[PDB]
Design a protein around this ligand. Structure first.
Ligand SMILES: CC(C)(COP(=O)(O)OP(=O)(O)OC[C@H]1O[C@@H](n2cnc3c(N)ncnc32)[C@H](O)[C@@H]1OP(=O)(O)O)[C@@H](O)C(=O)NCCC(=O)NCCS
Length: 142
């Protein structure tokens, strides 16, 4: 009688490790609108010690942080690309994540793209899917 478990196949321990260790985040789809999920999670991660670089070519500053047009333009190392964009947009961002040397691609709810997931797996990145960083942080480090 196997229980349902997340499809990315990571244990609670693996996620807790990624949430404790990898705190340089490129948050793609960042938005200054309070209503968007990306704004709520970006504020929460900044309140919990994450260094969050918003990425969205539309904006130059979001929540007081300079906003970049690509993960590759961020002047720092990036460990996690946290995706708040539609599925077909994620392939490009996974490609940027690979070229930047990120360690983890994190597909937030309704962003998963199989093809993008495949390029990330081929390059060796850890893939987290169908979870929220905020909710996993609350569940595991709360
Ligand atoms: C993926 C998602 C944003 C789609 O929602 P949607 O209502 O269709 O919104 P859109 O994709 O049109 O736009 C959202 C943002 O993407 C940004 N965006 C669009 N194209 C982009 C691109 N190429 N690069 C970066 N950002 C982009 C837009 O600027 C927009 O922000 P804005 O309204 O400030 O302009 C949405 O399903 C989502 O928020 N998923 C994550 C949900 C989640 O995990 N919530 C946490 C719950 S605890």
């Amino acid at each position: 009688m196997e229980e349902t478990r997340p499809i990315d196949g990571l244990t609670d321990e693996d996620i807790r490790e990624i949430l404790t260790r990898y705190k340089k985040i490129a948050l793609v789809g960042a938005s200054p609108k309070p209503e968007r999920d990306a704004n709520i999670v970006m504020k929460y991660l900044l309140e919990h010690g994450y260094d969050v670089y918003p990425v969205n070519p539309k904006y130059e500053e979001v929540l007081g942080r300079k906003c970049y047009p690509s993960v590759l333009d961020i002047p720092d190392k990036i460990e996690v690309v946290d995706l708040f964009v539609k599925p077909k947009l994620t392939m490009e961002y996974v490609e940027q994540a690979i070229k930047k040397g990120a360690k983890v691609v994190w597909f937030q709810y309704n962003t998963y793209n199989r093809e993008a997931s495949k390029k990330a797996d081929e390059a060796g990145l850890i893939i987290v899917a169908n979870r929220c960083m905020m909710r996993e942080h609350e569940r595991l480090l709360g």
